[PDB]
Scaffold this active site. Sequence first.
Site, PDB file in Angstrom:
ATOM      1  N   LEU A   1       0.839  -1.191   0.000  1.00 40.32           N
ATOM      2  CA  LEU A   1       0.000   0.000   0.000  1.00 40.32           C
ATOM      3  C   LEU A   1       0.878   1.246   0.000  1.00 40.32           C
ATOM      4  CD1 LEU A   1      -2.578   1.683   0.289  1.00 40.32           C
ATOM      5  CD2 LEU A   1      -2.525   1.213   2.750  1.00 40.32           C
TER       6      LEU A   1
ATOM      7  N   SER B   1      -5.089   2.671  21.854  1.00 42.19           N
ATOM      8  CA  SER B   1      -5.635   2.215  20.579  1.00 42.19           C
ATOM      9  C   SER B   1      -6.145   3.377  19.725  1.00 42.19           C
ATOM     10  CB  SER B   1      -6.763   1.207  20.822  1.00 42.19           C
ATOM     11  OG  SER B   1      -7.412   0.855  19.613  1.00 42.19           O
TER      12      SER B   1
HETATM   13 CA   LIG Z   1       0.717   2.815  -2.968  1.00 44.15          CA
END
Ligand SMILES: [Ca+2]
EC number: 3.5.1.-
Length: 670
Positions: free
Chosen positions: A35, A255
């Site tokens: 990503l 968190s």
């Molecule tokens: Ca990317």
Amino acid sequence: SGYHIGVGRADCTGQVADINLMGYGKSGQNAQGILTRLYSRAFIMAEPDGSNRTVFVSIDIGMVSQRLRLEVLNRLQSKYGSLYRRDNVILSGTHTHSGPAGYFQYTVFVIASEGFSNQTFQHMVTGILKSIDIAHTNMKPGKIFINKGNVDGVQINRSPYSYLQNPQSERARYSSNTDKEMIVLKMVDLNGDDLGLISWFAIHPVSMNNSNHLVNSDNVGYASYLLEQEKNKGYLPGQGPFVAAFASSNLGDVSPNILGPRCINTGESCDNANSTCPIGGPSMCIAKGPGQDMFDSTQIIGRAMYQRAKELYASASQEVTGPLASAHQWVDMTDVTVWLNSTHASKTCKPALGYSFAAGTIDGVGGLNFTQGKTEGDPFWDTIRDQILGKPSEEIKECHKPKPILLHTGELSKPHPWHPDIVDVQIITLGSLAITAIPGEFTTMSGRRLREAVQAEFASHGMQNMTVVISGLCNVYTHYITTYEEYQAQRYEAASTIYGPHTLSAYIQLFRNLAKAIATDTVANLSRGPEPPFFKQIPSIVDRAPKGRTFGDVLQPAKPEYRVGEVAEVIFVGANPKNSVQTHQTFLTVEKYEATSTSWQIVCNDASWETRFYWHKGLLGLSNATVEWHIPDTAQPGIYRIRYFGHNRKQPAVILSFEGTSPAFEVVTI
Ligand SMILES: [Ca+2]
Ligand SMILES: *[C@@H]1O[C@H](CO)[C@@H](O[C@@H]2O[C@H](CO)[C@@H](O[C@@H]3O[C@H](CO)[C@@H](O)[C@H](O)[C@@H]3O)[C@H](O)[C@H]2NC(C)=O)[C@H](O)[C@H]1NC(C)=O
Ligand SMILES: *[C@@H]1O[C@H](CO)[C@@H](O[C@@H]2O[C@H](CO)[C@@H](O)[C@H](O)[C@H]2NC(C)=O)[C@H](O)[C@H]1NC(C)=O
Ligand SMILES: *[C@@H]1O[C@H](CO)[C@@H](O)[C@H](O)[C@H]1NC(C)=O
Ligand SMILES: *[C@@H]1O[C@H](CO)[C@@H](O)[C@H](O)[C@H]1NC(C)=O
Ligand SMILES: [Zn+2]
């Protein structure tokens, strides 16, 4: 008068295929692409004359391992001699749970990683070294400024009832059960232009949950991404002189999934001591992010941190001045005598994991129906533990109470020690700023106690008004550190406090001493401590193209036309991404045609959060490489194309490069 400052950023991304992602310890969470890229970001400060250097490195990685640090330090000595040593170099992990695994030497993390990946490991090392080399060769006279501010609505405490176990008077001195304060370190040259920044802020980079298969740096990575892209106008992601690193802090019980723990079946709140649901148990109790999906949640949380970081950087006025100093010590954390009184002492233990470790958290639940808060064992699992690993001694059981031992790693050394015994403790001071290199994950109150205790020590010895920060996941991973009171409740973090109930008290004691040595100028009087050890110790596949085709050929072109907001997808005949694992900066580019110059200009790469790269394995060497371009609303209309860069394996064993280019397509105005 002021400091010499150097900064650098370098790609430290391992392989994005045929390997597991590190962090969640999930069985099937293998990498299927990327990503965004993972970077090592180094910051080097030096005195005006160039002496007394200090290095802080923030690395897009789940944990910094003993083996990683030792390898890096050896190579630093080879190239730089005495410039960068064990004492003046901090290697800190951002704690992203979407990085490639297989870079540990201790058995526990090797089991989790399902092995050791030399490829991934080496590129991490060269990546870290490259970032340091850039900073080293680009140092400039400049100044350092510091600023503080709160960041709202990006965090919750994932073990609030354990937090409540802490003394009332202590809890009364704080406004929240998480450290909302962000600390930005601003670096400029004497001409006043921007060099770089460091941002300490406590938060788990787990916005991308364990269903994810794309390599990324999560929320803090996206925040760094936005900061760098804003300053480095005209530069592609991963490029540009300005370096912006988010540094992990005391994130142990913090968190980013701010919707809180809820039962998947009923939607009811499961904010309870067990983190469990009446129907379905612990596996139903999960905390979610603010977005429509994990990508959106990651960016929402990441943007908020970026926004505050940007504001604090701009309005920074308090200059940081003073001498540079550093102190380091190796410590056998299995045998530390900790004083609770003037008259009363206890002891740290040989490393062991509690029952509730197998329970996971609300950010990622375990599969085996374990619940958090287990202060008692059962004959069933005690049996399995005894039969397979061995029976824990009575000493280690008594030392760890009330923690029920699931894994007594301290007494498991085959083939190699499962958990470390030798741990790094170190402090680096830049004037009035003190950085404590924490070898794990301090909870909120744990970090508060150590910060203030170390600050108090400096004060007692003439170093007034010290700003102390917790630097998380440094040097070596020893899991979580809870307060004595938190340890009693035996939630996940408490069960993951491997050196027993007095682990925190030991560190406070140890780090106080380090601070004292620095202030009194007697760091040389510190004992070196026991030296840590350096342990020495998928079938090959030839990639194939479809008949009549070759690598890089388009199997599925993009649509002829797209409107902004949509997703352009192109599929190429691909090869294994691990073949490309060192001039391979990107697997893909998105390129825009400029009619005036009649040329193509790169607008995106695989580091752009807007683009995604998927790899799918086929039969007998066949494979596809999918590039997705999630066209942003801000994207300009025009003619675009998507390219693919990979490497194929032939067979003695040879790796060749190839390229693919999709037919031109268009983004339209509507
Ligand atoms: Ca990317
Ligand atoms: C991690 O986050 C992703 C979101 O990006 C979660 O994906 C979501 O998964 C749930 C359940 O797997 C999906 O909910 C429902 O699934 C039923 C299946 O019967 C489906 O028919 C419904 O349409 C409903 O949505 C949800 O659609 C899906 N969301 C996305 C965007 O894919 C994933 O569950 C999270 N994983 C963990 C472990 O928290
Ligand atoms: C690579 O991509 C092609 C086309 O995008 C995939 O082909 C599909 O393949 C299945 C069986 O493998 C066929 O039943 C479909 O008719 C094909 N679709 C099209 C549009 O041709 C191919 O499977 C992909 N291979 C891998 C390993 O992912
Ligand atoms: C690991 O990789 C490095 C460099 O890539 C190489 O020098 C070393 O021999 C490798 N080790 C093994 C066991 O393959
Ligand atoms: C030392 O610890 C013991 C154990 O609880 C306690 O009884 C005693 O009061 C402590 N000493 C002081 C001075 O508080
Ligand atoms: Zn963690």
